[PDB]
Structure 1
Amino acid sequence: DNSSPPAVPQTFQVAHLHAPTGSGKSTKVPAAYAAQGYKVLVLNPSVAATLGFGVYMSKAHGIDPNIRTGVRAITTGGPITYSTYGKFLADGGCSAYDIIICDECHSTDSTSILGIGTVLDQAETAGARLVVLATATPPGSVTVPHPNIEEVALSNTGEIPFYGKAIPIEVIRGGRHLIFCHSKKKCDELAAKLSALGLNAVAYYRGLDVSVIPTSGDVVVVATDALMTGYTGDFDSVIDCNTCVTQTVDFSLDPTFTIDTTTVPQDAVSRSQRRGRTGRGRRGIYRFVTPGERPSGMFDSSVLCECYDAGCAWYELTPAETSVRLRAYLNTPGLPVCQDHLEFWESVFTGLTHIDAHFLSQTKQAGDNFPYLVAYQATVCARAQAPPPSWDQMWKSLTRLKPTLHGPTPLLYRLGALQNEVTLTHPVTKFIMACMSADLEVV
């Protein structure tokens, strides 16, 4: 049904394309639309993917497309353009293209979600005949059985307790095995427990080397998801804790909301990926704490906030402009889904007035999450000559003013751990609290 590329409707259509990564959906398909005389934009969340498409197209097909990223925009004048969603947003959206392919349209990072809503809101007005929502992983996808992987639940019987169940020593003594834990911390403690017990064991996370994992010999690697992005092949078995760390918003009311990195049950995509490290060129084993529960393509409300934040920080969009684009995304069927907290987030940002410009550009440059919310809290701090909620790296634009800031932090919301006393008097704190309780979904 959605596995063939849509023929161009001679007016306006939104269409889905479910096809594997590499299969032609982002290359051969735009090539065929271009040979019929169309101009085609193809959007993707990744700078590397985007650059990779221009290499393929010119070398396979002698087609030199325009390649547009945050760094540079390469204009050849040909009919196909590749861009990241972020560069697309930075360029004003549709502002040119007959057909727009939104690639990896299952992505739930904020640039993808804002970028996609923008296409959906603007595509027809801008002269487009076709928007394609393309993906290899449609929303509601679950982990399906693999022919080469045998799946065996852990029980309570075992000498090594692990996320509420147990690993018998015998199933990891001998051969090469990968245990997934959620944090650098568990990795280290489990790695150390196992080593006490006589096992060749080694931790791996963000910021250690790939060479810390022996090519050969019995090993138990206790790792985070950093592994899949840093390292190549192997494994007789995977032991999956079945949880990850994700950005979540909590309407904690202490005074307002909390945005932090918390432990959530994994979704199908993380389950599929962690399992997929065994079964390569021979049979594999996958062991797990709990059966697959979350389908792919649900995202957190704090990603809606992040969209509003980036709209203000990067793209000179008022919160109301951000809502039209997000509304178009939430109103389009077959896309990732989320609680409808558009009115609420819009209203919060609408009263985040008179941010310090130099603070915001410092935060933007340093690359911290939520550049607008961090610089706004900082602004508020420097205007009350108060310290930031902690001296986390986040707050470094206040470090030069550190000797002159005294007293309780005027807390607007929580972006991490609290390390100073707080006052809840601030007019903006009050404003955000009233945004919460003026919204039936958020109260």
Structure 2
Amino acid sequence: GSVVIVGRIILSSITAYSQQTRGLLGCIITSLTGRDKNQVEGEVQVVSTATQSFLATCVNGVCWTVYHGAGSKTLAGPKGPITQMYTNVDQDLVGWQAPPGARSLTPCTCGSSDLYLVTRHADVIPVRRRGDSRGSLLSPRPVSYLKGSSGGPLLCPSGHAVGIFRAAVCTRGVAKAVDFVPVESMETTMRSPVFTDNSSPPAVPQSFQVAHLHAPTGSGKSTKVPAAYAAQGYKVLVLNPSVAATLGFGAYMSKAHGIDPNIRTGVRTITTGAPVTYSTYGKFLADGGCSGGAYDIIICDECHSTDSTTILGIGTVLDQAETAGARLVVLATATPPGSVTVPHPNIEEVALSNTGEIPFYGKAIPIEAIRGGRHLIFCHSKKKCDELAAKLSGLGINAVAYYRGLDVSVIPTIGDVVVVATDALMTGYTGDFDSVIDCNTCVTQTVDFSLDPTFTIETTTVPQDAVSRSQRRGRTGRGRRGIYRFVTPGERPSGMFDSSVLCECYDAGCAWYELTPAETSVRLRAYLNTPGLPVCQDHLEFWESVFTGLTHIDAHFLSQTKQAGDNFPYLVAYQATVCARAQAPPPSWDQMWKCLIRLKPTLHGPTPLLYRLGAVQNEVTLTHPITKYIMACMSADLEVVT
């Protein structure tokens, strides 16, 4: 789908009023076609994706809005859809050349502090400038009031543009201030190149440089280029988020380039004294980070990964490399933020239909598409993998499930196989397949600042992003012809991750890498402060405060939660600890709370509840000093998207 203009806010002492122009079927036809033949008027537009609705502002003949709304989407145009002229994921800003009929705001000249926010309902809201990019609501309002209004203008009293609205600063759900993209950031963006080239790798400079490398997987970005660099006399470190891939790099290098490198994974370590090391992000973290004077180049490969260990690993590299003697860091990926899935020459893309013996996600797979040869099926959940795998095994198809917890060796290396796998496959297993069949969904975790008493980590099934889609399909076409079959054509925007992932970082810092909340903050801030990386609301102070007060965990409970491989081993073990000491039962008797099963006869009364990680079946008490500490943490200013 394209973005669709569904109406407009008209502007006059500033006043505003709205006009609707499209309906539901009008929005959805024009989204599918990309052809909007309807005449654009005014300087603020009301815009829609079939998911969401927001605002767009014309300044300098560019119609502008928020990346967190528009993503990399086309805008529906008279002569078909409009490619975005500008994309700045770092600034949460996108832009299309203004349609005919559209007027523009002129940027703000004279330095006014008294500002006016235009909302999607056409209310004009007094705002006092505080920073380059912050203004504070003269009268605070529910955060709900401001939702639907991002991309909207902040005007000075002259009616010129100060910038566009992107986020609300919040105290226990009440919006106190506004975050905005300043009109000066649009001019920098308009000045920046149409296309920058990062296909070719940098040259090792005189002083420290952070560089970016955008190139296909298996171009040589993690094989040819390290060897190339080492040929020049350099010591290089290669970081990857997969054990399987890290391991495999060792045997390929010693064949391809005569370098028998050092391999560092949790499971296995090889020290050869070569000038190339391959390490995982976790093993790099578990190691202490940057070994003083050990490396000239660090290559952070697969830097599009938004799992806690990658973000924490990369952040560590950016905080340490320059002091630890490095000259070059880089950041390597085939799918940077703001990328979209484009045709690949070696891959046939075929949508599924309702014709098929095997039901798949409301569509069907014909048994003839998978009967012989090697095929891979992405399911979103462990439960689906087992169901599907069972079906096909009954049909006589050589089928196997793979997910977190299972050993890789369930997947046969050599025969006919259907591998029914979650994304866990893409860290356990290196191989390529004849076809890939994709459900186009994954399971993600969202933080909810629910004040019932504190926060919640929800687990939801969501549409895949453009990174997922491409990484998944990239399991076929590897220098040979592959098919890709899919349930839905869609993709949500690449390059953003949830605040829960920051929580995951502090947790893993504490559980695995013996990192203080303060030291985690140092590392994440580097990741956050570096452009070209995935983006996230800055809730570093908030999570640091939360984990900072989580003291004297039971180490035995810690061991057990770590051993089990739960998400948030630290958050779970700390609840367990609190329950033990309070002599009170756990939130429920789910497998999460296995470690307390030995105390089940003595624990009674209400749960000293800290935060919600799943279902809560017992009564709760808000009296624990710790619950009280976290409740107080909730009063922090949190930037939430509108």
Structure showing greater radius of gyration is 2
Separation (CA, whole Å) in 1 of partners of 2:377 and 2:253 = 39
Q: Greater CA deviation, 273-282 or 81-90? A: 273-282
Q: Would the aligned equivalents of 1:344 and 1:442 in 2 still touch at CA under 8 Å?
A: no
From the superposition, tell whether residues 23 and 440 of structure 1 become closer, same or farther in structure 2 (CA, over 3 Å).
closer
Deviations 1:269-292 (A, max 9, x none): 333355567889999886766542
Q: Greater CA deviation, 378-387 or 93-102? A: 93-102
Separation (CA, whole Å) in 2 of partners of 1:217 and 1:310 = 38
Q: Would the aligned equivalents of 1:141 and 1:296 in 2 still touch at CA under 8 Å?
A: yes
Separation (CA, whole Å) in 2 of partners of 1:82 and 1:220 = 31
Separation (CA, whole Å) in 1 of partners of 2:419 and 2:432 = 11
Q: Would the aligned equivalents of 2:469 and 2:491 in 1 still touch at CA under 8 Å?
A: no
Deviations 1:413-440 (A, max 9, x none): 1222223222222222222122122223
Q: Greater CA deviation, 208-217 or 404-413? A: 208-217
Report the CA distance between 1:256 and its aligned residue.
Answer: 1.6
Q: Greater CA deviation, 310-319 or 189-198? A: 189-198
The TM-score, its normalising length taken from structure 1, stands at 0.82
Report the CA distance between 1:140 and its aligned residue.
Answer: 2.0
Report the CA distance between 1:338 and its aligned residue.
Answer: 1.4
Q: Would the aligned equivalents of 1:111 and 1:307 in 2 still touch at CA under 8 Å?
A: yes
Q: Would the aligned equivalents of 1:143 and 1:292 in 2 still touch at CA under 8 Å?
A: no
Report the CA distance between 1:403 and its aligned residue.
Answer: 0.9
Q: Would the aligned equivalents of 2:243 and 2:428 in 1 still touch at CA under 8 Å?
A: no
Matches for 1:19-418 after TM superposition, within 5 Å: 19-95=215-291, 96-146=294-344, 182-183=380-381, 241-272=439-470, 290-418=488-616
Task: Tell me how large the CA RMSD over aligned residues is.
Answer: 4.3
From the superposition, tell whether residues 33 and 212 of structure 1 become closer, same or farther in structure 2 (CA, over 3 Å).
closer
Report the CA distance between 1:23 and its aligned residue.
Answer: 2.3
Deviations 1:104-162 (A, max 9, x none): 11111111110100110111111111111112222222111345767677899999999
Report the CA distance between 1:380 and its aligned residue.
Answer: 0.3
Report the CA distance between 1:242 and its aligned residue.
Answer: 3.4
Deviations 1:278-324 (A, max 9, x none): 88999988676654232322212111111111111222221111111
Deviations 1:240-280 (A, max 9, x none): 55322122222222222222421112111333355567889
Equivalent in 207, 212, 221 of residue 11 of structure 1 = 207
Report the CA distance between 1:71 and its aligned residue.
Answer: 3.2
Secondary structure at the counterpart of residue 329 of structure 2: strand
From the superposition, tell whether residues 405 and 17 of structure 1 become closer, same or farther in structure 2 (CA, over 3 Å).
same
Deviations 1:82-122 (A, max 9, x none): 21111111111113211111111111111111010011011
Secondary structure at the counterpart of residue 400 of structure 1: helix
- Considering Cα pairs closer than 8 Å and 6+ residues apart, tell me whether 1 or 2 has the greater RCO: 1
Secondary structure at the counterpart of residue 14 of structure 1: coil
Q: Hey, which of these two has a bigger chunk of helix by percent?
A: 1
Matches for 1:425-440 after TM superposition, within 5 Å: 425-440=623-638
Separation (CA, whole Å) in 1 of partners of 2:330 and 2:619 = 51
Separation (CA, whole Å) in 2 of partners of 1:91 and 1:45 = 15
Separation (CA, whole Å) in 2 of partners of 1:285 and 1:123 = 42
Separation (CA, whole Å) in 1 of partners of 2:298 and 2:374 = 45
Separation (CA, whole Å) in 1 of partners of 2:468 and 2:582 = 44
Secondary structure at the counterpart of residue 56 of structure 1: helix
Report the CA distance between 1:362 and its aligned residue.
Answer: 2.6
Deviations 1:340-362 (A, max 9, x none): 11111111111111212222223
From the superposition, tell whether residues 196 and 125 of structure 1 become closer, same or farther in structure 2 (CA, over 3 Å).
closer
Deviations 1:189-242 (A, max 9, x none): 899999999999999977999999999999999976578889999999977553
Deviations 1:55-91 (A, max 9, x none): 1222333322222222343222222222111111111
From the superposition, tell whether residues 65 and 197 of structure 1 become closer, same or farther in structure 2 (CA, over 3 Å).
closer
From the superposition, tell whether residues 258 and 25 of structure 1 become closer, same or farther in structure 2 (CA, over 3 Å).
same
Q: Would the aligned equivalents of 1:298 and 1:337 in 2 still touch at CA under 8 Å?
A: yes
Q: Hey, which of these two has a bigger chunk of strand by percent?
A: 2
Report the CA distance between 1:331 and its aligned residue.
Answer: 1.0
From the superposition, tell whether residues 92 and 436 of structure 1 become closer, same or farther in structure 2 (CA, over 3 Å).
same
Separation (CA, whole Å) in 2 of partners of 1:270 and 1:249 = 21
Secondary structure at the counterpart of residue 15 of structure 1: coil
How many residues align? The count is 443
Q: Greater CA deviation, 141-150 or 198-207? A: 198-207
Q: Greater CA deviation, 362-371 or 4-13? A: 362-371
Separation (CA, whole Å) in 1 of partners of 2:400 and 2:323 = 56
Q: Would the aligned equivalents of 2:244 and 2:428 in 1 still touch at CA under 8 Å?
A: no
Separation (CA, whole Å) in 1 of partners of 2:347 and 2:267 = 41
Report the CA distance between 1:40 and its aligned residue.
Answer: 1.3
Q: Greater CA deviation, 208-217 or 339-348? A: 208-217
Q: Would the aligned equivalents of 1:50 and 1:82 in 2 still touch at CA under 8 Å?
A: yes
Separation (CA, whole Å) in 1 of partners of 2:407 and 2:316 = 40
Report the CA distance between 1:19 and its aligned residue.
Answer: 2.0
From the superposition, tell whether residues 431 and 14 of structure 1 become closer, same or farther in structure 2 (CA, over 3 Å).
same
Q: Would the aligned equivalents of 2:244 and 2:429 in 1 still touch at CA under 8 Å?
A: no
Q: Would the aligned equivalents of 1:205 and 1:223 in 2 still touch at CA under 8 Å?
A: yes
Secondary structure at the counterpart of residue 445 of structure 2: strand
Q: Would the aligned equivalents of 2:539 and 2:638 in 1 still touch at CA under 8 Å?
A: no
